[PDB]
Amino acid sequence: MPPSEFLDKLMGKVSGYDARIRPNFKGPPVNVTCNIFINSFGSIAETTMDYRVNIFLRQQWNDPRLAYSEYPDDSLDLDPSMLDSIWKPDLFFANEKGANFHEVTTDNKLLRISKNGNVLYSIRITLVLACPMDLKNFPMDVQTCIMQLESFGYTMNDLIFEWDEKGAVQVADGLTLPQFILKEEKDLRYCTKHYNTGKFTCIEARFHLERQMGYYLIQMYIPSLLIVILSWVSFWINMDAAPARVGLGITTVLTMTTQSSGSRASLPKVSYVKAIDIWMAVCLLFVFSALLEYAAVNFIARQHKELLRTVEEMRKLFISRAKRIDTVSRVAFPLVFLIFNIFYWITYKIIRSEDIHKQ
Amino acid sequence: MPPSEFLDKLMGKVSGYDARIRPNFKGPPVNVTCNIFINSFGSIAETTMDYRVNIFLRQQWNDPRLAYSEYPDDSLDLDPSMLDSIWKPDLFFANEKGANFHEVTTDNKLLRISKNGNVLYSIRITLVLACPMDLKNFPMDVQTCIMQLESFGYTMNDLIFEWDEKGAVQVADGLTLPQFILKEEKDLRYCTKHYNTGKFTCIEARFHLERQMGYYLIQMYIPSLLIVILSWVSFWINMDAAPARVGLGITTVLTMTTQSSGSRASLPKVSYVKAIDIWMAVCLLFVFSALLEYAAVNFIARQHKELLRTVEEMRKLFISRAKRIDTVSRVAFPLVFLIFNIFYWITYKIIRSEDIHKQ
Amino acid sequence: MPPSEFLDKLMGKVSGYDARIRPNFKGPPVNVTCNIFINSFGSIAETTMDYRVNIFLRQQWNDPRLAYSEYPDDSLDLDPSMLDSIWKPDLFFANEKGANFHEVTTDNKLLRISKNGNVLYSIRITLVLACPMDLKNFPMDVQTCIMQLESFGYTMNDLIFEWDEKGAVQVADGLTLPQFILKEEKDLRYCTKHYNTGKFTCIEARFHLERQMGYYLIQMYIPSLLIVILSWVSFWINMDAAPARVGLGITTVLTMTTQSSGSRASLPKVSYVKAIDIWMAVCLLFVFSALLEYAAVNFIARQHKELLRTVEEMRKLFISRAKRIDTVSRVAFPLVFLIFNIFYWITYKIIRSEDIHKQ
Amino acid sequence: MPPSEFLDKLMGKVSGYDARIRPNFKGPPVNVTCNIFINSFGSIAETTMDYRVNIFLRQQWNDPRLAYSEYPDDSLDLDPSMLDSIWKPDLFFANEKGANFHEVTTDNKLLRISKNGNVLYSIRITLVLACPMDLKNFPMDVQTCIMQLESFGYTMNDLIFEWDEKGAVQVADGLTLPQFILKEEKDLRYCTKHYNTGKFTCIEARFHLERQMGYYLIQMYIPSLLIVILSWVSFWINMDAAPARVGLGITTVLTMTTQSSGSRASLPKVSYVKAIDIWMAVCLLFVFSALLEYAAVNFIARQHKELLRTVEEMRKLFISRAKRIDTVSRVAFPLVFLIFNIFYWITYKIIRSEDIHKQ
Amino acid sequence: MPPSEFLDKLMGKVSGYDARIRPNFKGPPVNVTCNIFINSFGSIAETTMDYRVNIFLRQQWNDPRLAYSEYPDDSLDLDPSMLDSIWKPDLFFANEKGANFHEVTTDNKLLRISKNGNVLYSIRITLVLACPMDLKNFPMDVQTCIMQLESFGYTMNDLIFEWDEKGAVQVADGLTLPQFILKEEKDLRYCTKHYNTGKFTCIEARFHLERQMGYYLIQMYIPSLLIVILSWVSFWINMDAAPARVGLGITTVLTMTTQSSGSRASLPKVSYVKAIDIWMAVCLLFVFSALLEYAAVNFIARQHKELLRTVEEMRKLFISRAKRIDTVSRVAFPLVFLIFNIFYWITYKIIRSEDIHKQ
Numbered sequence A, B, C, D, E: 001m002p003p004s005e006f007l008d009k010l011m012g013k014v015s016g017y018d019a020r021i022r023p024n025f026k027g028p029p030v031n032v033t034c035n036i037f038i039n040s041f042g043s044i045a046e047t048t049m050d051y052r053v054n055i056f057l058r059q060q061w062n063d064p065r066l067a068y069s070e071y072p073d074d075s076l077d078l079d080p081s082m083l084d085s086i087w088k089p090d091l092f093f094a095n096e097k098g099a100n101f102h103e104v105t106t107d108n109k110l111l112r113i114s115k116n117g118n119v120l121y122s123i124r125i126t127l128v129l130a131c132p133m134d135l136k137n138f139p140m141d142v143q144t145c146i147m148q149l150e151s152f153g154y155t156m157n158d159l160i161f162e163w164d165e166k167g168a169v170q171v172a173d174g175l176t177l178p179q180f181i182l183k184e185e186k187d188l189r190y191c192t193k194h195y196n197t198g199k200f201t202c203i204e205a206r207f208h209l210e211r212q213m214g215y216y217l218i219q220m221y222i223p224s225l226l227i228v229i230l231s232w233v234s235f236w237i238n239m240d241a242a243p244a245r246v247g248l249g250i251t252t253v254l255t256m257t258t259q260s261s262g263s264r265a266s267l268p269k270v271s272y273v274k275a276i277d278i279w280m281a282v283c284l285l286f287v288f289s290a291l292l293e294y295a296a297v298n299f300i301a302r303q304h305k306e307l308l309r310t311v312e313e314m315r316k317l318f319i320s321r322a323k324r325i326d327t328v329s330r331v332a333f334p335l336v337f338l339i340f341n342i343f344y345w346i347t348y349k350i351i352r353s354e355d356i357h358k359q
């Protein structure tokens, strides 16, 4: 019983199998269970709001036809070069750019057929998928990125898509992302589509990504803090009269503006204010207030110069103010900073915890 | 009544359907109604003057042929692999670069045919479209971007394009742009094309985009203002004789030139002057005038040095000028700035309001 | 008289039309008139010396065959899917990179055939074309960019290319370039090609582009001038003894070097010296000479310090020199700058005027 | 005995050779030996974690069919245009992006067939392969990059992949990399794949790459060291009272922050701390501690100013501290730096030596 | 004698011409002479070590078949659409990335056939070719870039490649490169390839490129020199006691480090030290030594301060040293620089002259 004779006999010009007609025509819709395996996730672009994923799509549906029932083995592994002579369902991705196939030495495709007629179609695909991420809290956030699968040409009374009950979404073992930590929530929902042409089936899968704060802390939170420390200690424990104290402030402001521009470099332009903007704005406000304080001290010194020639009675009165302000500044500034840091870190921790619970 | 027999019978070698001849040949022009659905707008490049759009083109026309009239159901959903055996009309985009199709698991295409002969052709297309935007007012403006559809090979007495009376342009729900706000004007006009070869049909669609000022305000209007504030308060409330006061001005000018270069970084080179250029030029003029004022004060001080050895009569005469100028400067500069800001913001608000009314 | 029968009958297996043999074989060369319409010019890259153009090529030639002479209408608009069964001439572009076609909903192609046999072939093409621009005068210049069309496979006694007598080159109405102004010279020449294999026909078209000076003036000529003004007025109207005067020069030099590097940023590396290099070099020379002058003043002051303890006789002798140099510098520097600006702007104006007359 | 007759006769419609059925069907799995030749390795991207390689894949397997046994010469070199009429095995790369073929003048392919039936299939391929490199030790490290080959459609009882016993991996003579030194370990392992669909064969090859420290040393280790040297010697051998000493520190800090940002520029964002970060952090700590020391000296000087009007008894007591600290600083700082450098270089040398031994 | 009948008759199903069998089968190897014309060289990337070239490949070989010998004209220009029905030889480029063809309006291809059977095959190709350039001497060097042509599928007793005796390599008239000057050496060698599969023919062509020093001199050699001049003259002709003199050095060092980083920006990372690195290192050493000298002068001044209250006997002794060092520095530094420049320019001139003679 040669393989070739049977092979053609099933889907040949002698067989009545038309590949342009859906199975069970004029009948109940063809149910399709979809299984996805993630081979290599990664390369998430924050600029143009998209990520790259290489999946192994797997879809099964039941055909009354192609149930040979005359062979010792129930499952037959067929050629992937005769995949044009069967009824593949139409499937497209809604948030999709590009999405090439792969042709290395052979087409990366798979066909299997059981005795009853259940088929197994497996396709390797790299997808560039659009994720409209919300950057309300930039360094610490959970981002949800969407994969949607729809039928382009078939209305709801044909080709209903369903998920797989067990192991709908899998991940390759030892798969890591440099920037994000993937979570195991693996949310799945059915989100039907309505158009003027008709109503079309859809199923979607949701992934939760948390952002590591390790890079961001080292890159920005540490340098900005160190420059605040530098300004604080450096000028106040210097003599009242000096060009250096003044110059220090200007240079510190220059560093702050360069770092502020540097932070908002990779990020796409957005209307709302991110957390990192709040932090850098507060640090800039601290150094600006510090330079203003020194300018005020200089004015008090100017008053002393005018007084110098009941002369000494006024002199000390102003000078003592000079000293009092200088000491209060020394003890006042760090405590206020400490207070800011605590009420900032606490609230952000509460927001991120609430966000993960909400999602 | 098997599907295959009829299916071929309509558009087969036994049928007299030639796909190279227009329907109703030697007759009135084939009218075509066009419906467009916008799946995902975005990614607008200001440099090379273009934007990206992913649409769902839909065009309907009437064929006397293909009106079977022998089936229980009026509408038949046919295969998208037999779309080469019918009379699709020619259609191209005038301001177009690229414009690939999509081939993911199947071609993303749709064919429908009613009992009378009205067809429905639906195509998924990503377009890179050229928009010749006018940057007269850079941060606040309304930009109109053009989509034009034309018949390449058919003159006006064939294949007249028309718009759809109801729901000509739709937008996918919850579609947002990071940089712009789309408006609901959805202007539609017919803009016929004349060539030496002949006169060709065209229809166009206009989109109005407003620019959010949230990013621009934070990125440039706030830092420049803060550096003006810094210069103003810092030097004048310092003693007349100091190297610091001089140095401050030079560094402030350095910041202004770097920010001015930074502003005109993404923008393409254009002859006309943008609003942001006016703002940065005025701020640069303020700090330049401030440094000139300090230089003049130094010259008055030089006069005092020459006088120092009717000697004291001249001395005070110049010194009082020194004081008078210093105080007037303190009160003079902010009010003039305030006046500038009001007459700048008011006029730009009037221009943008006029522009939206005009469009 | 059905369309299909005739349609095939002309260029069918029953017709003796071989599409691999040139018309009028063993005869006079096939003359071809070429008409070009420019749909969208632009995107000129100065780095890799090329520009992008989207044209509508149109070529006409006479075929003795395909002159049916039996139809009421002289001109027939045929399908663009049967363009493989005729004798298209070979045509390629010599300074060409890439040059894709366009396939949106249909091929963008056109076929027309008259009663005598004159055909009309219209093709939409985007060309990346190499322009070896000469940057001798960078901000103000006229650049000539070349389009060449040649026959790859046919020697001069076949397929002679000719231009069209009227309307050889057209431009779409309201077509503008952000950087350049297109001129209406529209030069056309025939520039035959000689090879060892044979002698091949060619025709070329020349476009003249002038550069707007509006962006360049604002970006570089104004900031550099303002920094020269700043240095000039700032240090000389300050007291002889100061750290500030010295520091000012160094910072001004830093600005000059950064701007000089910034100017030569987009530009490709070239051996010859551009006009902008001359301007920035002269401005750098002015500030360098200014700092040297201050250093000399300091040395004269050093002489006074040595003299201070016929002592006063020497003292004033040197001091008066100090004053004399300071005043002459004040009046000397701007006039010399003014002279430089006039003899620079005048000569460049003469060169550009001569260049346009020459071209 | 004409070539054509035999040529077709072997794999023709008269032959029973079906190219869709595996050789030795219903039998032991088809064993495949794989030989790889590396034509041009290189272009390793640290950002998106991948490298480029151009290989010569070679795979041999035994076919009972195609053993003609009637020719004088055992080995026949066949055409590479009839490679569609045989049973090529499926093969794909797991960590693969892209992987085009090459079509220059002909397809770059090879077919050979021996008398017994052993075939030789040779394919030229450029692979972009994903390497998840570990940057724990950035300048000095050994990186292992993975190539994996798998059967997409065939389970373990078909198409078992095996390596070649002799010369499995070769390298073209005189092949060098600008950044890395390739090692000759050439590790080979079999790393079978398990899926829910089935169990699939795989074989992998490991390459060891060491990083040259020549560029990194010159680019970063030398400038940072020179700036530490500059700060150290420059300020301490200057008078106690000066604006210059203060300013020096701020500028040195500015250089350190710019260099620190410059170092972490090419590198992708990662949570863990690299060796270069440790080095730059320690150098920044040294200059920060130096500026703090100067600030403390200024405070001691302030005490002297307060004392100046048992007055002189206190004065010297503080002044001597000033001198003592200044001298100890002079001798203290370099030795501590020397100690740091030795314990840093030694430990990194031990870690890299351990790593190469482990791998 | 119609063209079509003969045309097919030569290479038709009635002719015994099999296009899968080499001419003169079981015979001496098919000799192939190769002629290359360079249409447009250029776009040489120093980063990823490659260049772009657009060539006109021409190869001739002798076929016993296709020698009609019955026509008045010896040479026939055939269609380039029947190039699939002949025996083209296999040819690939070893150092090749990409290498597309060109399809503009027609395939850019040529076929000619003489009476004896000598064919002429002409192909237009753009090649991206890998050149492993040696950057030992960066601004002045001669670089040799390699083109290699090999037979992928045929061993040495078939398809031997040979060069053309006259005019093997040509260049289009008036072809210029912005960065390099092409030389006329046009070296040609045969460099056979050995593999385990077999021994394969190869022929190679060598191009010599010299680098213009005009851009590099202006961009780096002039600014660095000017900044050395600035430092030299500026500080030494200033009073011994000043904050300005100190600050000058730090700023000059900042310029040197920025320029040094700027130089090594386009260049790929390499272990060895380039000439430009030597030059910038020496200039940095000069300014570093200058600042150290000023620091030493300050220490001598400190000694004078300690002495000031046999007191005056010590005072002058140190002061005279101060003066002596200051003058020697003034005359010492430029001569040493002059010596460096001469022994640097001379040796590099000798090395480049030796290199061109060697090549």
Ligand SMILES: *[C@@H]1O[C@H](CO)[C@@H](O)[C@H](O)[C@H]1NC(C)=O
Pocket: A028, A029, A030, A031
């Ligand atoms: C597909 O699913 C629908 C709804 O679950 C059901 O009504 C229909 O019978 C199913 N089709 C089958 C089992 O063929």
Ligand SMILES: *[C@@H]1O[C@H](CO)[C@@H](O)[C@H](O)[C@H]1NC(C)=O
Pocket: B028, B029, B030, B031
């Ligand atoms: C198409 O529209 C034109 C103008 O509206 C009309 O004259 C013509 O009859 C229409 N064709 C039809 C209805 O087939």
Ligand SMILES: *[C@@H]1O[C@H](CO)[C@@H](O)[C@H](O)[C@H]1NC(C)=O
Pocket: C028, C029, C030, C031
């Ligand atoms: C084509 O032009 C040439 C030169 O103008 C002429 O000799 C020849 O007769 C022309 N061919 C025609 C008119 O068919």
Ligand SMILES: *[C@@H]1O[C@H](CO)[C@@H](O)[C@H](O)[C@H]1NC(C)=O
Pocket: D028, D029, D030, D031
């Ligand atoms: C292939 O290898 C397996 C295991 O080494 C062996 O059992 C089998 O017989 C081999 N197949 C052959 C030699 O055809």
Ligand SMILES: *[C@@H]1O[C@H](CO)[C@@H](O)[C@H](O)[C@H]1NC(C)=O
Pocket: E028, E029, E030, E031
């Ligand atoms: C090709 O060249 C080889 C060596 O030069 C020679 O032996 C052989 O006869 C040549 N083949 C011909 C002339 O057909």
